[PDB]
Write a protein that holds these residues in place. Structure first.
Motif, PDB file in Angstrom:
ATOM      1  N   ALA B  11       0.829  -1.162   0.000  1.00 22.47           N
ATOM      2  CA  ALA B  11       0.000   0.000   0.000  1.00 22.47           C
ATOM      3  C   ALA B  11       0.881   1.234   0.000  1.00 22.47           C
ATOM      4  CB  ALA B  11      -0.942   0.053   1.148  1.00 22.47           C
ATOM      5  N   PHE B  12       0.550   2.372  -0.717  1.00 20.15           N
ATOM      6  CA  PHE B  12       1.259   3.595  -0.943  1.00 20.15           C
ATOM      7  C   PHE B  12       0.266   4.729  -1.289  1.00 20.15           C
ATOM      8  CE2 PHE B  12       4.741   6.176  -1.802  1.00 20.15           C
ATOM      9  CZ  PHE B  12       5.982   5.503  -2.008  1.00 20.15           C
ATOM     10  N   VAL B  13       0.361   5.924  -0.573  1.00 17.84           N
ATOM     11  CA  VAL B  13      -0.609   7.012  -0.673  1.00 17.84           C
ATOM     12  C   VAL B  13      -0.063   7.863  -1.750  1.00 17.84           C
ATOM     13  CG1 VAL B  13      -1.559   6.842   1.681  1.00 17.84           C
ATOM     14  CG2 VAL B  13       0.331   8.365   1.230  1.00 17.84           C
ATOM     15  N   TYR B  14      -0.809   8.516  -2.646  1.00 13.62           N
ATOM     16  CA  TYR B  14      -0.187   9.254  -3.803  1.00 13.62           C
ATOM     17  C   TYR B  14      -1.166  10.271  -4.214  1.00 13.62           C
ATOM     18  CZ  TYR B  14       2.292   4.777  -5.339  1.00 13.62           C
ATOM     19  OH  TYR B  14       2.948   3.573  -5.597  1.00 13.62           O
ATOM     20  N   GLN B  60      -0.572   4.956   7.955  1.00 16.26           N
ATOM     21  CA  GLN B  60      -0.671   5.888   9.053  1.00 16.26           C
ATOM     22  C   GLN B  60       0.790   6.103   9.413  1.00 16.26           C
ATOM     23  OE1 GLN B  60      -1.788   5.578  13.512  1.00 16.26           O
ATOM     24  NE2 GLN B  60      -3.668   6.047  12.235  1.00 16.26           N
ATOM     25  N   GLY B  61       1.096   7.388   9.667  1.00 10.58           N
ATOM     26  CA  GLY B  61       2.423   7.777  10.149  1.00 10.58           C
ATOM     27  C   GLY B  61       3.044   8.900   9.345  1.00 10.58           C
ATOM     28  N   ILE B  62       2.109   9.394   8.461  1.00 11.44           N
ATOM     29  CA  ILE B  62       2.305  10.600   7.754  1.00 11.44           C
ATOM     30  C   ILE B  62       1.604  11.675   8.540  1.00 11.44           C
ATOM     31  CG2 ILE B  62       0.243  10.221   6.291  1.00 11.44           C
ATOM     32  CD1 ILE B  62       1.729  11.755   4.083  1.00 11.44           C
ATOM     33  N   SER B  63       2.342  12.787   8.721  1.00 12.50           N
ATOM     34  CA  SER B  63       1.984  13.847   9.659  1.00 12.50           C
ATOM     35  C   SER B  63       3.003  14.936   9.579  1.00 12.50           C
ATOM     36  CB  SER B  63       2.026  13.340  11.116  1.00 12.50           C
ATOM     37  OG  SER B  63       3.309  12.941  11.561  1.00 12.50           O
ATOM     38  N   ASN B  64       3.557  15.199   8.360  1.00 14.89           N
ATOM     39  CA  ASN B  64       4.438  16.321   8.207  1.00 14.89           C
ATOM     40  C   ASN B  64       4.653  16.663   6.732  1.00 14.89           C
ATOM     41  OD1 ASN B  64       6.310  13.731   8.949  1.00 14.89           O
ATOM     42  ND2 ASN B  64       7.737  15.095   7.734  1.00 14.89           N
ATOM     43  N   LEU B  65       3.801  15.953   5.976  1.00 15.80           N
ATOM     44  CA  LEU B  65       3.755  15.957   4.506  1.00 15.80           C
ATOM     45  C   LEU B  65       2.397  16.050   4.057  1.00 15.80           C
ATOM     46  CD1 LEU B  65       6.051  12.845   3.998  1.00 15.80           C
ATOM     47  CD2 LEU B  65       6.579  15.348   3.573  1.00 15.80           C
ATOM     48  N   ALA B  67      -1.619  16.571   2.322  1.00 12.28           N
ATOM     49  CA  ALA B  67      -2.704  15.680   1.967  1.00 12.28           C
ATOM     50  C   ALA B  67      -3.379  16.445   0.845  1.00 12.28           C
ATOM     51  CB  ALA B  67      -3.664  15.317   3.122  1.00 12.28           C
ATOM     52  N   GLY B  68      -4.269  15.693   0.077  1.00 13.27           N
ATOM     53  CA  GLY B  68      -4.984  16.249  -1.070  1.00 13.27           C
ATOM     54  C   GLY B  68      -6.017  15.248  -1.467  1.00 13.27           C
ATOM     55  N   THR B  95      -8.797   4.708  -8.142  1.00 12.54           N
ATOM     56  CA  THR B  95      -8.735   5.972  -8.928  1.00 12.54           C
ATOM     57  C   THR B  95      -9.265   7.111  -8.061  1.00 12.54           C
ATOM     58  OG1 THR B  95     -10.882   5.387 -10.019  1.00 12.54           O
ATOM     59  CG2 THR B  95      -8.816   4.741 -11.102  1.00 12.54           C
ATOM     60  N   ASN B  96     -10.162   6.887  -7.026  1.00 15.29           N
ATOM     61  CA  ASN B  96     -10.840   7.843  -6.160  1.00 15.29           C
ATOM     62  C   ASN B  96     -10.413   7.367  -4.810  1.00 15.29           C
ATOM     63  OD1 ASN B  96     -12.626   9.128  -4.305  1.00 15.29           O
ATOM     64  ND2 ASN B  96     -14.434   8.986  -5.707  1.00 15.29           N
ATOM     65  N   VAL B  97      -9.589   8.174  -4.078  1.00 16.15           N
ATOM     66  CA  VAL B  97      -9.319   8.012  -2.637  1.00 16.15           C
ATOM     67  C   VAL B  97      -9.237   9.436  -2.191  1.00 16.15           C
ATOM     68  CG1 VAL B  97      -7.640   7.175  -0.895  1.00 16.15           C
ATOM     69  CG2 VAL B  97      -7.796   6.030  -3.124  1.00 16.15           C
ATOM     70  N   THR B  98      -9.336   9.757  -0.882  1.00 15.78           N
ATOM     71  CA  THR B  98      -8.987  11.048  -0.383  1.00 15.78           C
ATOM     72  C   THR B  98      -8.161  10.711   0.767  1.00 15.78           C
ATOM     73  OG1 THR B  98     -11.044  12.020  -1.154  1.00 15.78           O
ATOM     74  CG2 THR B  98      -9.673  13.417   0.229  1.00 15.78           C
ATOM     75  N   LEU B  99      -6.993  11.355   0.942  1.00 16.44           N
ATOM     76  CA  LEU B  99      -6.172  11.174   2.129  1.00 16.44           C
ATOM     77  C   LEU B  99      -6.592  12.016   3.286  1.00 16.44           C
ATOM     78  CD1 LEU B  99      -3.583   9.743   3.288  1.00 16.44           C
ATOM     79  CD2 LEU B  99      -2.231  11.832   2.646  1.00 16.44           C
ATOM     80  N   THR B 100      -6.590  11.348   4.505  1.00 15.03           N
ATOM     81  CA  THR B 100      -6.621  12.152   5.730  1.00 15.03           C
ATOM     82  C   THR B 100      -5.450  11.680   6.501  1.00 15.03           C
ATOM     83  OG1 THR B 100      -8.083  10.833   7.247  1.00 15.03           O
ATOM     84  CG2 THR B 100      -9.183  11.995   5.449  1.00 15.03           C
ATOM     85  N   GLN B 101      -4.660  12.658   7.092  1.00 20.82           N
ATOM     86  CA  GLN B 101      -3.518  12.342   7.939  1.00 20.82           C
ATOM     87  C   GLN B 101      -3.875  11.946   9.358  1.00 20.82           C
ATOM     88  OE1 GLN B 101      -0.017  14.938   7.289  1.00 20.82           O
ATOM     89  NE2 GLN B 101      -1.553  16.490   6.766  1.00 20.82           N
TER      90      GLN B 101
END
Lengths: 102, 101, 51, 188, 50
Positions: B11-14, B60-65, B67-68, B95-101
């Motif tokens: 898994a990778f957030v982009y 989880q563990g992104i918190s300084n970079l 989101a969009g 194709t559709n995700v939304t990131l929340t930190q």
């Protein structure tokens, strides 16, 4: 001709049906992975070998796995059933281990 | 079937601003990556299987970079060239995700 | 959720996860045993024992 | 080869050593219609090379990626992590640690007497006279093994001239010169 | 009965050597209770290899 013939019973008939017959005589061929870059060493013996069988006589029509679903393309050559993954969780307890006679 | 080893749901957030929609492959975004353990059981041969596994994949563990609006690739992933998976699809590109930190 | 209180033992990969640990110090457990973690693995394989 | 996560890593593999003007290759067994967004994380935590490459419709690929040594931010020492963020259909994130060091050359001065005893006591100055000028990067006090070895940066395809001046108390001070073109032992 | 691959963003980016890791079962709050005990697992003779 050693293909199952497609038969016309008499003029008026139209069924035209073939068949083939298959056994797997093995071929085992080591795809190798180490246990100190993933934790886990792997001998993966690729997927037996096909063979056509007419009246009990087999002749080795090569690696089956690719033809026959399920298959996974590891090193681009699809490996299927009639295989083995032997699994070596090497760590500082010596080595834990498990096995899938695929 | 009984699965004797365990395996991974990579898994990778982009970013979606960084996406190539003509081949299904996100094009960039150094952000966060992670993966899930999937246990069935550590079965000693046949007789221990779990047919349906509900996997809520973790990142989880992104918190300084940033989101969009996000795209995320996933894949049923053997443990490191494992036993033979798939009658498909392993590969899952949302194709559709939304990131929340 | 009102449905709750979960006993959670945490145990190594060599020790069974169907069986609660016999030693349970009430805050942690020591595993004074080695593991060797391979380069690009970022993980410790551990069992979360719950029933 | 190691089959990291199901995709067969053929390259990069963890631990690879590189020199001046040598090439990073990308060949991995992907699932088709995969890109690899390839991040060369330098030892200052920065992607001095991000580039997006395309795998072929079969599963394979032999691509040349980045030419190390021939581009700025690769011209001097140190350790990189090429992260394949294989941003295909299959997300594989592998930290693949890689090294680099420039090319370096030893150029040698020697003194002798026909008494049958090699001479000693020399202050021997090797000069970087590739600049067009005598840029002193290493001076040696000559050793008793009769090799005056000095380490200096080098690069492929350049006539790296070096002037070796021998200034020594008890005998005549003398100046010879050499040229290493690429890597070679220059001994006179 | 879980196997968890405990995730960390720098211990495949941190170098080889004698490490010790404290693995704490703590709820991301909003979730039910844990730990009628151990509440932690400590590996006290671990060895990273990078």
């Amino acid at each position: 001709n050693v293909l199952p013939t497609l038969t016309e019973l008499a003029a008026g008939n139209g069924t035209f049906t073939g068949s083939l017959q298959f056994t797997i005589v093995p071929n085992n061929t080591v795809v190798q992975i180490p246990s100190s870059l993933t934790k886990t060493s792997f001998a993966v013996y690729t997927n037996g070998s096909l063979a056509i069988v007419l009246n009990g006589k087999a002749y080795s029509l090569g690696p089956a796995g690719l033809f026959l679903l399920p298959f996974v393309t590891y090193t681009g050559s699809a490996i299927g059933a009639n295989a083995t993954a032997i699994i070596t969780v090497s760590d500082g307890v010596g080595t834990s281990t498990t096995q899938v006679p695929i | 079937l009984p699965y004797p080893q365990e395996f991974q749901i990579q898994a990778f957030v982009y970013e979606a601003s960084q996406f190539n929609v003509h081949t299904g492959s996100p094009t960039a975004a150094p952000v966060y990556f992670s993966y899930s353990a999937v246990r069935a059981y550590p079965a000693l041969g046949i007789g221990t299987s779990v047919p349906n596994l509900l996997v809520y994949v973790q990142l989880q563990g992104i918190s300084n970079l940033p989101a969009g609006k996000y795209v995320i690739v996933l894949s049923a992933v053997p443990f490191a060239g494992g036993p033979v998976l798939s009658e498909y699809p392993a590969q899952l590109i949302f194709t559709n995700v939304t990131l929340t930190q | 959720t009102a449905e709750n209180f979960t006993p959670i033992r945490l145990a190594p990969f060599q020790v069974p996860a169907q069986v609660p640990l016999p030693n349970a110090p009430k805050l942690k457990y020591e595993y004074n045993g080695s593991i060797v973690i391979t380069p690009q693995q970022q993980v410790l394989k551990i069992y979360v024992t719950s029933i | 080869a190691v089959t990291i996560n199901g995709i067969t890593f053929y390259s990069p593999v963890p631990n690879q050593t590189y020199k001046y003007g040598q090439q990073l290759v990308l060949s991995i067994q992907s699932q088709p219609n995969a890109l690899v967004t390839l991040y060369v994380y330098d030892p200052k935590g920065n992607v001095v090379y991000n580039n997006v490459y395309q795998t072929n419709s079969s599963g394979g690929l032999t691509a040349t990626i980045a030419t190390f040594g021939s581009t700025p931010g690769f011209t001097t020492v140190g350790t990189y992590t090429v992260s394949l963020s294989v941003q295909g259909t299959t997300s594989e994130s592998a930290s693949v640690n890689v090294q680099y060091v420039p090319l370096t050359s030893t150029i040698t001065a020697t003194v002798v007497n026909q008494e049958g005893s090699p001479l000693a006591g020399a202050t021997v100055q090797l000069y970087n006279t590739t600049s067009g000028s005598n840029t002193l990067v290493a001076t040696q006090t000559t050793n008793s093994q009769g090799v005056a070895t000095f380490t200096v940066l080098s690069f492929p395809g350049v006539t790296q001239t070096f002037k070796l001046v021998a200034s020594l108390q008890g005998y005549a001070a003398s100046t010879a010169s050499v040229s290493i073109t690429g890597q070679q032992n220059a001994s006179v």
